Design a binder for this molecule. Structure first.
Ligand SMILES: [Mg+2]
Ligand SMILES: [Mg+2]
Ligand SMILES: [Mg+2]
Lengths: 390, 389
């Protein structure tokens, strides 16, 4: 019987997590929920799952929630603010914390769950993109157990030995028999587009949410998954490669010393890796029909060409350059993408802008959230500057 | 290493034995050969003894053993030489040996294999007949001494690697269901006649498909793997499926309760599963070229056509009928295949011969190697008669 705190409960990952709980009531108890300002949805979740605690992002939201709950005679205690969220992430009786507050704003609560020794289900990506060293050092310090919920990281996790799975990101891949992690992805809608057509890609062509569309066409999404993966799995540059797999049947793979490659497959569904993570080392049922091998297309593979995906190369370079570089790249990219979606720059200008920012860098390695914030803001400025000027 | 693993290799001069030595040769600080067992191949045994200096070697008879000792003497070896079944069984059970490569083929391989298991060893299983013929006996003995079994064959190895750790550690006597396992997926290529029109089957010559070739041409190989797989993994009929995968990049896979699948992939290099099994639970390098994903083509999947592959269905039937039936099936098939190879019967006869023998016998479930052997002879003989018609 697991006690849960869910950080970022009203969003998509929040609801999927709650969905698993709803299907497995004897396995999972919700102790605490933390959300932003969506009072209507948070009330509905508190009324269904009876948490002991709830926290909103601000006092005004908390007060409206307190009213809604009190009308139903609920027992739930309501708080607000970042400190409250951190406290709920560290409660004694809690076994499992879903860290799904998005953006850099998600760092402090994530880090509080990690600092409390909890099983942490990692749904926040900036933690590792921007201050991986601080996060993974805190992991080793507290022995916290990380479990990735995004499909690729979750497939690498399942393709690894228990020994590494239970010592996530602070055990040696090599000593434990791992030769290299194989991070896979589809290559986006432009995997076969003639290179000459890239300069003409429009927002509507990349877009048929919107920013994630663009990140998956540039492979920035894969680049970010790459950097988080070097931190999550304690891998060097030589211990990871990226392979294209158009059909998205394999989710990712792991090569071992003797030649063996273990791979995880399954029909694409958000809930599956969440449910794997939450139930681990048990398994519980899915909604979706099991993958049928007579109905998958043939499975194919390639190597990503840097001419076609220069952002990928850029994210690797940024990775090897350090955390200030990846913080900056991440921030720069957000600006680039909106600028593209706002028809201000060409599709092909994204890498250029991003590279300019990354290579213009000369700041120290960040060692806290505060220093990450500084770099993030500087990088948005320079990126915006670099945009305006062409 | 101060935790070197000591090895007994049974059937040291076969191809599995030599590949096992290759992994030793690549990791000389991790593995030490303590004993080698072979049959009649005196020259080969000697080259291996002179390379790895085992404490002991056995041959299958005294003529073999005496001449081996002569060459070992000429070259100044400290290897003590023995012969006979008893010797092999003792070599399989030395106190200081951690693991036994059980690679003696045929029913001849059962005594030594059983001796390793009973000594609670890490047993690297490379003898089909052990589980096809007396599964119940071998598995009861595994549970009873807690021996750790490690499938060496491609597909069984792939399945082992794709299963939860808790299953791996209690291999053969743990619950698939309780560990989130839903289904074992046994894959195979379909062999050379996967796409031959059925009406040409009757005309297939021994060439177009060596017992080995034929076995995978009929997919008797896979049905055999299927029976062994039921014992090895403690799977019911409903917990195992067969899938055709022509390119054989995926070596086999496991479905879990959440619908997710784990597969092991690699290249055809037999050192992969051997090094896996030998290093277990650690891993080692052994010179294997990492699968290159630019060079694999499209991977494709399909269900086996029992019309094209009747043997498979027969193997499943035999399995459901019990150990006498599967023992009979194994034996019938040897006689059957040789009869196809010797230009005495249609390719297309092999199954009917096999099913006829399997279906014509009044047997009792064997409960010892000896009774296994009795069903084997009986069944070989019946097969001989069926052929005369
Ligand atoms: Mg992803
Ligand atoms: Mg020793
Ligand atoms: Mg095989």
């Amino acid at each position: 019987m697991k006690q849960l705190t869910i950080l970022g409960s009203t969003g998509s990952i929040g609801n999927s997590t709650l969905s698993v709980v709803r299907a497995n009531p004897e396995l999972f108890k919700v102790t605490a929920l933390v959300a932003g300002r969506n009072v209507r949805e948070m009330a509905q979740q508190c009324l269904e799952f009876s948490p002991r605690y709830a926290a909103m992002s601000d006092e005004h939201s908390a007060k409206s929630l307190r009213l809604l709950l009190a009308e139903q005679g609920s027992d739930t205690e309501v708080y607000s603010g970042e400190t409250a969220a951190c406290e709920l992430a560290a409660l004694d009786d809690v076994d499992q914390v879903m860290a799904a507050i998005v953006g850099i704003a998600g760092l402090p609560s994530t880090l509080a769950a990690i600092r409390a020794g909890k099983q942490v289900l990692l749904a926040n990506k900036e933690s590792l993109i921007t201050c991986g060293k601080l996060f993974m050092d805190e992991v080793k310090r507290s022995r916290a157990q990380l479990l990735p919920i995004d499909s690729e990281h979750n497939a690498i996790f399942q393709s690894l030995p228990e020994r590494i799975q239970r010592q996530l990101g602070y055990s040696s891949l090599n000593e434990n028999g791992v030769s290299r992690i194989i991070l896979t992805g589809s290559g986006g809608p432009f995997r076969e587009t003639p290179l000459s057509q890239f300069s003409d890609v429009t927002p509507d062509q990349a877009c048929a949410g919107r920013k994630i569309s663009v990140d998956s066409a540039t492979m920035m999404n894969k680049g970010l998954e790459y950097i988080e993966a070097r931190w999550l799995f304690n891998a060097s540059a030589e211990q990871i490669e990226v392979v294209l797999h158009p059909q998205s049947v394999i989710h990712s793979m792991v090569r071992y010393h003797d030649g063996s490659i273990l791979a995880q497959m399954g029909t694409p569904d958000m809930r599956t890796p969440i449910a794997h993570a939450m139930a681990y080392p048990m398994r519980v049922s899915s909604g979706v029909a099991p993958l049928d091998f007579c109905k998958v297309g043939a499975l194919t593979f390639t190597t990503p060409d840097y001419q076609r995906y220069p952002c990928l190369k850029l994210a690797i370079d940024a990775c090897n350059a350090g955390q200030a570089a990846t913080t900056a790249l991440n921030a720069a990219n957000e600006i680039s993408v909106m600028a593209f979606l706002d028809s201000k720059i060409r599709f092909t200008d994204i890498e250029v802008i991003n590279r300019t920012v990354v290579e213009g860098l000369l700041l120290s390695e960040p060692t806290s959230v505060e220093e990450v914030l500084v770099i993030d803001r500087k990088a948005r400025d320079v990126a915006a500057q670099v945009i305006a000027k062409l």
